[PDB]
Coordinates of C-alpha atoms and ligand atoms in Angstrom, one line a residue:
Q228 CA -6.4 -11.6 31.9
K229 CA -7.0 -8.0 33.4
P230 CA -7.7 -4.9 31.3
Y231 CA -5.3 -2.3 30.7
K232 CA -4.3 0.7 28.1
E233 CA -1.4 1.2 26.5
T234 CA -1.1 3.4 23.5
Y235 CA 3.0 2.4 23.2
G236 CA 3.0 6.3 22.5
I237 CA 1.6 5.7 18.7
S238 CA -1.9 6.1 16.7
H239 CA -4.5 3.4 16.3
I240 CA -7.3 2.0 14.4
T241 CA -10.0 1.3 16.5
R242 CA -12.5 -0.7 17.0
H243 CA -14.9 2.0 17.8
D244 CA -14.3 3.9 14.4
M245 CA -14.4 0.8 12.4
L246 CA -17.5 -0.2 13.6
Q247 CA -19.2 3.3 12.1
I248 CA -18.0 2.7 8.9
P249 CA -20.5 0.2 8.0
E250 CA -23.3 3.2 8.4
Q251 CA -21.4 6.1 6.9
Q252 CA -19.7 4.4 3.7
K253 CA -23.5 4.4 2.3
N254 CA -22.8 7.7 2.1
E255 CA -21.7 8.6 -2.4
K256 CA -18.9 11.0 -0.7
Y257 CA -17.1 8.2 0.3
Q258 CA -17.4 5.8 -2.6
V259 CA -15.7 5.1 -5.5
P260 CA -17.6 5.7 -8.6
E261 CA -19.5 3.2 -11.2
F262 CA -17.3 2.7 -13.8
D263 CA -18.2 2.2 -17.3
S264 CA -17.3 -1.2 -18.4
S265 CA -17.4 -0.7 -22.2
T266 CA -14.5 1.9 -22.1
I267 CA -12.6 -0.2 -20.5
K268 CA -9.4 -2.1 -22.8
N269 CA -6.3 -3.9 -21.5
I270 CA -2.5 -2.5 -21.6
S271 CA -2.0 -3.1 -25.3
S272 CA 1.8 -3.1 -24.4
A273 CA 1.5 -5.5 -21.9
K274 CA 0.2 -8.4 -24.1
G275 CA -2.3 -10.9 -22.6
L276 CA -0.2 -10.0 -19.1
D277 CA -2.2 -8.8 -15.5
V278 CA -1.0 -5.2 -14.8
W279 CA -2.4 -5.0 -11.0
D280 CA -0.3 -2.8 -8.4
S281 CA 1.3 0.7 -10.1
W282 CA 3.0 3.3 -8.9
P283 CA 4.4 6.4 -10.6
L284 CA 7.9 7.5 -10.8
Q285 CA 7.2 10.3 -7.9
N286 CA 8.8 13.7 -6.9
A287 CA 10.2 14.1 -2.8
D288 CA 6.9 15.3 -2.2
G289 CA 4.7 12.8 -3.8
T290 CA 4.1 14.3 -7.4
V291 CA 4.0 13.5 -10.5
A292 CA 8.1 13.5 -11.8
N293 CA 8.6 14.0 -15.3
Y294 CA 11.3 11.9 -16.9
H295 CA 13.0 13.7 -19.5
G296 CA 9.7 14.3 -21.0
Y297 CA 7.8 11.0 -20.2
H298 CA 6.0 10.2 -17.1
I299 CA 6.6 6.4 -15.9
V300 CA 4.8 3.8 -13.7
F301 CA 6.1 0.8 -12.7
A302 CA 3.5 -2.2 -12.3
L303 CA 3.4 -5.7 -10.9
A304 CA 2.5 -8.0 -13.9
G305 CA 2.4 -11.6 -14.8
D306 CA 0.9 -14.4 -15.9
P307 CA -2.9 -14.6 -15.2
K308 CA -2.3 -18.6 -15.2
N309 CA 0.0 -18.3 -12.2
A310 CA -0.6 -16.1 -9.5
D311 CA 3.2 -17.0 -7.7
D312 CA 4.1 -15.1 -11.0
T313 CA 4.9 -11.3 -10.0
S314 CA 7.6 -9.3 -11.6
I315 CA 7.8 -4.9 -11.7
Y316 CA 7.4 -3.8 -15.3
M317 CA 7.7 -0.3 -16.2
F318 CA 5.5 1.9 -18.3
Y319 CA 6.0 5.0 -19.8
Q320 CA 4.0 7.7 -21.6
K321 CA 5.3 11.1 -23.3
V322 CA 4.1 14.0 -20.8
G323 CA 0.9 15.4 -21.8
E324 CA -1.0 11.9 -23.3
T325 CA -3.7 10.2 -21.6
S326 CA -4.9 7.6 -23.4
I327 CA -4.5 3.9 -22.1
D328 CA -2.7 3.5 -25.5
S329 CA 0.3 5.9 -24.8
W330 CA 1.4 3.6 -22.3
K331 CA 4.4 1.9 -23.8
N332 CA 6.2 -0.9 -22.4
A333 CA 9.7 -1.0 -21.6
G334 CA 9.7 -4.3 -20.1
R335 CA 11.1 -5.7 -16.4
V336 CA 12.7 -3.6 -14.4
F337 CA 15.1 -6.5 -13.6
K338 CA 16.9 -9.4 -15.3
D339 CA 17.2 -12.6 -13.7
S340 CA 20.1 -12.4 -12.7
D341 CA 20.4 -8.8 -11.6
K342 CA 19.6 -10.7 -8.0
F343 CA 22.7 -12.7 -8.1
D344 CA 24.8 -10.1 -8.9
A345 CA 23.7 -7.6 -6.2
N346 CA 26.2 -9.3 -3.9
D347 CA 23.5 -9.3 -1.4
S348 CA 22.5 -12.7 0.8
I349 CA 18.8 -12.4 1.5
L350 CA 18.3 -11.3 -2.6
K351 CA 19.5 -14.4 -4.0
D352 CA 16.4 -15.5 -2.8
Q353 CA 13.9 -14.0 -4.5
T354 CA 11.4 -15.5 -6.2
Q355 CA 8.9 -12.5 -6.4
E356 CA 9.1 -9.1 -6.6
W357 CA 6.2 -6.9 -5.0
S358 CA 5.1 -3.2 -4.5
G359 CA 6.7 -0.2 -3.6
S360 CA 7.2 2.9 -4.8
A361 CA 10.0 5.1 -6.8
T362 CA 11.5 8.8 -6.3
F363 CA 12.6 10.9 -8.6
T364 CA 16.0 12.1 -7.0
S365 CA 17.7 15.4 -7.2
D366 CA 20.6 14.5 -9.5
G367 CA 17.9 13.1 -11.6
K368 CA 18.2 9.1 -10.9
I369 CA 14.8 6.7 -11.1
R370 CA 15.1 5.3 -7.4
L371 CA 12.8 2.1 -6.8
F372 CA 11.7 0.7 -3.4
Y373 CA 9.8 -2.6 -3.7
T374 CA 9.5 -6.1 -1.6
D375 CA 11.9 -8.6 -2.0
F376 CA 9.1 -11.7 -1.4
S377 CA 11.3 -15.3 -0.9
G378 CA 8.6 -18.1 -1.6
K379 CA 11.7 -20.5 0.0
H380 CA 11.9 -18.4 3.1
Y381 CA 8.5 -18.7 4.5
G382 CA 7.4 -15.8 2.6
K383 CA 10.1 -13.5 4.0
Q384 CA 9.7 -9.7 2.6
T385 CA 12.7 -7.1 2.9
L386 CA 12.3 -3.5 1.8
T387 CA 15.0 -3.2 -1.1
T388 CA 16.2 -0.5 -3.2
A389 CA 17.6 -0.4 -6.7
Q390 CA 18.9 2.6 -8.9
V391 CA 17.5 1.7 -12.3
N392 CA 19.4 2.9 -15.3
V393 CA 17.6 4.4 -18.1
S394 CA 18.3 5.8 -21.5
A395 CA 15.5 8.4 -22.9
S396 CA 15.5 9.3 -26.7
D397 CA 12.6 11.6 -28.5
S398 CA 10.5 8.8 -29.4
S399 CA 11.6 5.4 -26.1
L400 CA 12.9 4.8 -23.1
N401 CA 15.2 2.1 -22.5
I402 CA 16.2 0.1 -19.1
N403 CA 19.5 -0.7 -19.8
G404 CA 19.9 -2.3 -16.4
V405 CA 20.3 -1.6 -12.6
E406 CA 22.8 -0.3 -9.7
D407 CA 23.0 0.0 -6.0
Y408 CA 20.4 -2.9 -5.9
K409 CA 20.1 -3.5 -2.1
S410 CA 18.3 -5.2 1.2
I411 CA 17.6 -2.3 3.4
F412 CA 15.2 -3.7 5.6
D413 CA 13.8 -7.4 7.1
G414 CA 12.1 -6.5 10.0
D415 CA 14.0 -6.1 13.9
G416 CA 11.6 -8.1 16.2
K417 CA 11.1 -5.5 18.3
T418 CA 9.1 -2.5 16.3
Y419 CA 8.0 -4.7 13.2
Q420 CA 7.5 -8.9 12.4
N421 CA 10.5 -10.7 11.0
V422 CA 9.5 -13.7 9.1
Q423 CA 11.3 -16.0 11.7
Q424 CA 8.8 -14.8 14.0
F425 CA 6.2 -16.4 11.9
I426 CA 8.1 -19.5 11.3
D427 CA 7.8 -19.4 15.3
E428 CA 4.2 -19.6 15.0
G429 CA 4.2 -22.3 12.5
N430 CA 4.1 -20.3 9.3
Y431 CA 1.1 -20.4 7.1
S432 CA -1.2 -23.0 8.9
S433 CA -1.0 -20.5 12.1
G434 CA -3.2 -17.6 10.4
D435 CA -0.8 -15.4 11.1
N436 CA -0.9 -13.1 8.1
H437 CA 3.4 -11.7 8.3
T438 CA 3.9 -8.5 6.3
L439 CA 6.4 -6.1 5.3
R440 CA 6.2 -4.6 2.2
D441 CA 4.8 -1.9 0.1
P442 CA 7.3 0.8 1.1
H443 CA 6.6 4.1 0.3
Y444 CA 9.3 7.2 0.0
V445 CA 8.7 10.6 1.3
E446 CA 10.8 13.1 2.1
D447 CA 10.7 16.4 4.8
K448 CA 12.8 18.9 5.7
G449 CA 15.7 16.4 3.5
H450 CA 15.3 13.6 5.4
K451 CA 15.0 10.6 4.0
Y452 CA 12.1 8.1 5.1
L453 CA 9.9 4.7 3.9
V454 CA 6.4 4.3 5.2
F455 CA 5.3 0.5 4.8
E456 CA 3.3 -1.8 5.7
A457 CA 4.6 -4.0 8.5
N458 CA 3.0 -5.6 11.2
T459 CA 3.7 -4.6 15.0
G460 CA 7.2 -6.2 17.5
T461 CA 7.5 -7.4 20.5
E462 CA 7.8 -3.8 22.5
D463 CA 4.7 -1.8 20.2
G464 CA 2.0 -4.0 21.4
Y465 CA 2.1 -7.6 19.3
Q466 CA -0.3 -10.1 18.7
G467 CA -1.5 -12.5 21.2
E468 CA -4.1 -13.5 23.8
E469 CA -3.2 -10.5 26.0
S470 CA -3.7 -7.8 22.8
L471 CA -7.6 -8.4 23.5
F472 CA -7.4 -6.5 26.6
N473 CA -6.2 -3.6 25.1
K474 CA -8.3 -0.2 25.8
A475 CA -6.2 1.7 23.5
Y476 CA -7.2 -1.0 20.5
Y477 CA -11.7 -0.4 21.0
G478 CA -11.2 3.6 22.1
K479 CA -14.4 5.2 23.2
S480 CA -14.9 4.4 26.5
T481 CA -14.4 1.5 29.1
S482 CA -17.9 1.0 28.8
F483 CA -17.4 0.3 25.3
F484 CA -14.1 -1.8 25.6
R485 CA -16.3 -4.0 28.3
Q486 CA -19.4 -5.0 25.2
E487 CA -17.0 -4.6 22.8
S488 CA -14.2 -7.0 24.3
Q489 CA -16.9 -9.3 25.7
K490 CA -18.5 -10.3 22.5
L491 CA -15.1 -10.1 20.8
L492 CA -14.1 -12.9 23.0
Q493 CA -17.4 -14.9 22.5
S494 CA -17.0 -14.7 18.5
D495 CA -15.8 -17.1 15.9
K496 CA -13.0 -13.9 15.1
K497 CA -11.3 -14.0 18.5
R498 CA -8.1 -15.9 17.1
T499 CA -8.4 -13.5 13.8
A500 CA -8.0 -10.6 16.4
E501 CA -5.5 -11.8 18.5
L502 CA -3.4 -12.2 15.3
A503 CA -4.1 -9.2 13.9
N504 CA -1.4 -7.0 14.9
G505 CA -0.9 -4.9 11.1
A506 CA 1.1 -1.7 11.2
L507 CA 2.0 1.1 9.1
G508 CA 5.7 1.5 10.0
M509 CA 8.4 3.6 9.4
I510 CA 12.6 4.3 8.9
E511 CA 14.7 6.4 8.0
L512 CA 17.5 6.1 5.4
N513 CA 20.5 7.6 4.9
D514 CA 21.9 9.8 1.8
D515 CA 22.7 6.4 0.3
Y516 CA 19.3 4.6 0.7
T517 CA 20.7 2.3 3.1
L518 CA 19.4 2.2 7.1
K519 CA 19.3 5.0 9.4
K520 CA 17.0 4.5 11.8
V521 CA 14.0 2.2 12.9
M522 CA 11.3 4.5 13.8
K523 CA 8.1 3.7 16.1
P524 CA 4.6 2.9 13.8
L525 CA 2.8 5.9 12.5
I526 CA -0.7 4.0 13.4
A527 CA -1.9 0.0 14.3
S528 CA -4.3 -2.0 13.2
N529 CA -4.6 -4.6 16.4
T530 CA -7.2 -6.8 16.2
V531 CA -8.9 -5.2 13.7
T532 CA -6.8 -6.7 10.6
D533 CA -3.3 -8.3 10.5
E534 CA -3.4 -6.4 6.6
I535 CA -3.3 -2.7 5.8
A536 CA -1.7 -2.2 2.7
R537 CA 0.1 0.1 0.4
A538 CA 0.8 2.6 2.4
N539 CA 0.7 6.1 1.4
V540 CA 2.0 9.6 2.4
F541 CA 2.4 13.2 1.4
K542 CA 2.0 17.0 2.5
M543 CA -0.8 19.0 0.7
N544 CA -2.0 22.1 1.5
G545 CA -0.3 22.6 4.8
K546 CA -1.3 19.0 6.6
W547 CA -0.1 15.9 6.2
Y548 CA -1.6 12.2 5.0
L549 CA -1.5 9.0 5.5
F550 CA -3.5 6.6 3.6
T551 CA -3.5 2.4 3.7
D552 CA -5.8 -0.4 1.5
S553 CA -7.9 -3.3 3.0
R554 CA -9.3 -5.7 2.7
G555 CA -13.1 -6.4 4.7
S556 CA -12.5 -10.2 4.3
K557 CA -9.6 -9.6 6.6
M558 CA -11.1 -7.7 9.4
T559 CA -12.7 -8.5 12.8
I560 CA -15.7 -6.0 12.8
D561 CA -19.3 -6.1 12.4
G562 CA -21.0 -5.1 9.8
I563 CA -17.8 -5.0 7.4
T564 CA -18.3 -7.7 5.0
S565 CA -16.1 -9.9 2.5
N566 CA -17.4 -7.6 -0.5
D567 CA -16.0 -4.5 1.0
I568 CA -12.7 -3.1 0.2
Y569 CA -11.2 0.1 1.6
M570 CA -9.0 3.0 1.4
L571 CA -8.6 4.5 5.0
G572 CA -7.1 7.6 5.6
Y573 CA -5.4 9.9 8.7
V574 CA -4.3 13.4 8.6
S575 CA -1.7 15.3 10.9
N576 CA 0.3 18.5 10.8
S577 CA 3.4 16.4 11.1
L578 CA 5.0 13.4 8.8
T579 CA 5.7 11.7 12.2
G580 CA 2.4 12.3 13.9
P581 CA 0.1 12.4 16.2
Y582 CA -2.1 10.9 13.0
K583 CA -6.2 11.3 13.3
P584 CA -8.5 9.0 11.2
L585 CA -9.7 11.9 8.4
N586 CA -13.9 11.3 8.6
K587 CA -14.1 11.0 11.9
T588 CA -13.7 7.1 11.2
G589 CA -11.2 6.7 9.2
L590 CA -12.9 5.9 5.3
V591 CA -11.9 7.7 2.6
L592 CA -12.8 5.1 -0.4
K593 CA -15.3 2.3 -0.5
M594 CA -16.0 -0.6 -3.0
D595 CA -17.9 -3.3 -2.4
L596 CA -18.3 -5.4 -5.8
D597 CA -18.8 -8.2 -6.7
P598 CA -14.8 -10.0 -7.1
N599 CA -16.4 -11.5 -10.7
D600 CA -17.4 -7.7 -11.3
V601 CA -15.5 -6.5 -14.5
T602 CA -15.2 -3.4 -13.1
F603 CA -13.7 -4.4 -9.5
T604 CA -11.3 -2.2 -8.4
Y605 CA -8.8 -2.5 -5.7
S606 CA -5.8 -0.9 -4.6
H607 CA -6.6 2.9 -4.4
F608 CA -3.8 5.0 -4.3
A609 CA -3.7 8.7 -3.9
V610 CA -1.4 10.7 -6.6
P611 CA -0.5 14.3 -4.9
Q612 CA -1.0 17.0 -7.3
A613 CA 1.0 20.3 -8.0
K614 CA -2.0 22.4 -6.7
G615 CA -5.2 22.7 -5.9
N616 CA -7.4 20.5 -3.6
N617 CA -7.4 17.6 -5.4
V618 CA -5.9 14.1 -5.6
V619 CA -5.8 11.4 -8.6
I620 CA -7.1 7.9 -6.9
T621 CA -5.4 4.8 -9.5
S622 CA -6.2 1.6 -8.7
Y623 CA -6.4 -1.5 -10.8
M624 CA -9.5 -2.7 -12.5
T625 CA -10.1 -6.6 -12.9
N626 CA -9.2 -9.3 -10.7
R627 CA -6.2 -11.2 -11.4
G628 CA -6.3 -14.5 -13.5
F629 CA -10.3 -14.2 -13.6
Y630 CA -11.6 -13.8 -17.9
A631 CA -9.3 -15.2 -20.4
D632 CA -10.1 -11.7 -22.7
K633 CA -9.9 -9.1 -19.9
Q634 CA -6.6 -8.9 -17.8
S635 CA -5.9 -6.6 -14.7
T636 CA -5.5 -3.0 -15.9
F637 CA -5.1 0.4 -15.2
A638 CA -8.7 1.4 -14.3
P639 CA -10.0 4.5 -14.8
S640 CA -8.7 7.2 -12.4
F641 CA -10.9 9.5 -10.6
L642 CA -10.5 12.9 -8.2
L643 CA -10.5 12.3 -4.4
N644 CA -11.2 16.0 -2.8
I645 CA -9.1 16.8 0.3
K646 CA -9.7 20.0 2.5
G647 CA -8.7 19.9 6.4
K648 CA -10.0 16.6 8.2
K649 CA -12.2 16.1 5.4
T650 CA -13.0 14.2 2.3
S651 CA -15.1 13.6 -0.9
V652 CA -15.0 12.1 -4.0
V653 CA -15.2 14.7 -6.8
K654 CA -18.7 14.1 -9.3
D655 CA -18.5 12.5 -12.3
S656 CA -14.6 13.1 -12.2
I657 CA -13.7 10.4 -14.0
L658 CA -10.6 10.1 -16.1
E659 CA -9.0 8.3 -18.8
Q660 CA -7.2 4.6 -17.4
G661 CA -4.6 5.0 -15.9
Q662 CA -4.1 8.9 -16.0
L663 CA -1.7 10.5 -13.2
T664 CA -2.4 14.2 -13.2
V665 CA -5.0 16.7 -13.7
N666 CA -2.8 18.8 -15.4
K667 CA -1.9 17.6 -19.5
Ligands
LIG994 O1 0.1 -14.5 2.3 C1 -0.2 -15.4 1.6 C2 -1.0 -14.8 0.7 O2 0.0 -14.4 -0.5 C3 -0.2 -13.3 -1.8 O3 -1.1 -12.5 -1.6 C4 -0.2 -11.3 -0.9 C5 -1.2 -9.6 -0.8 O4 -1.4 -9.7 -2.3 C6 -2.1 -8.3 -2.0 O5 -1.2 -7.4 -2.1 C7 -0.6 -6.5 -2.3 C8 -2.1 -5.0 -2.9 O6 -2.6 -5.0 -3.7 O7 -0.4 -7.0 -4.2 C9 0.6 -6.8 -3.8 C10 1.0 -8.6 -4.4 O8 0.6 -8.9 -5.3 C11 1.5 -6.6 -2.2 O9 3.0 -6.2 -2.5 C12 0.5 -5.9 -1.9 O10 0.3 -5.3 -0.5 C13 -3.5 -8.7 -1.8 O11 -4.1 -7.4 -1.3 C14 -3.4 -9.1 -0.4 O12 -4.5 -9.5 0.2 C15 -2.7 -10.0 -0.1 O13 -2.2 -10.8 1.2 C16 -0.9 -14.5 -2.6 O14 -1.7 -13.9 -3.9 C17 -2.6 -15.1 -1.6 O15 -3.4 -15.9 -2.6 C18 -2.0 -16.1 -0.6 O16 -1.1 -17.0 -1.0
CA995 CA1 -0.2 -11.1 12.8

């Protein structure tokens, strides 16, 4: 195939930028801080469950919501013995509290019957509830977005919404049920990959990784959007053999393209790179949270990785910041190892772009601890704050199903300083486990 260059009018995680990361990540500015294992507790209210991917109830701008005097955190939880047991639980604390022990458990958001009662063809085939976001509406409602995963339909993933009805008293919160529970988006083929395209490849045994998940709600000027983990479609730079010849995915220069493309073509990562077409996608919603418009991706990762997770985006001090979590084990970049775990970050003057890499390369956070390390963390999430130059980084701590006595839990939070197009971890800024805000 002949070399070409096509950006599709979107931003790209380039091979050249990613290659700079192995050397750059040695700087403590970009490193998840060391945690103290003897301070680490299981979520007392979770009662023997693994609790991993979590997200706070947020105001439209991403700041932590105050629901009737409480903070609310939604989290994936399930049986450590069953990797396919994943449901969304709702945890809550009184505003002002910081202890991990302050987090009470309201239980599952959903009843098993809810997906059937929803009168929603896709939802009644759901087998697992995967990550998303939650916004606190202007009329005081808890508005959840999450991933409908269907194990029965070859791992179909559908962006889904529901309103969570919650009674509040001086002592407790209680989930009464849900309403407006509906599928929003399952891909369109042209802009974002759908499950049929995955099945076209031969699903799981093809080596392809189909994703359409981790939706993050955000507003700008009263317009409503979800930014989410996805993969490109046929019209915005699809996976395939031809993709390795697109200079937009390499960057730097034709000299670098020539050298890097030929190396990749001769490597054992050729097929992996061909299949890699991860994207951070965007859709606009209507005021009833239905689909208004499929939009172009904010960024894509063709050749680099098929998996850029937990999309997060917010405006802070005049600039827009876009983050994603990603595993080095799924990348094709020399120098990046199977131990390496990242939060990558991008910056723009506008929500819809264009986005340029945060610390020249995209590196914001690096974690490389052994999967066996009790203080291992993943799923790092930047929580925007009402004021100041710091965001709070949350993550989950222990690997799922690894230890009988130590479950996946809220990691100790820490501070990330953000100014202009640069970030640095704040020295000795470790907070409580699952702490959402600096202010108390
Ligand atoms: O697709 C095959 C893969 O499926 C399952 O893992 C899916 C996915 O899980 C994690 O992604 C996040 C971030 O932590 O976790 C939830 C799901 O639990 C997702 O909404 C979110 O993106 C991992 O980080 C990913 O690497 C992984 O692909 C299953 O658990 C795997 O064993 C495997 O079968
Ligand atoms: Ca792919």
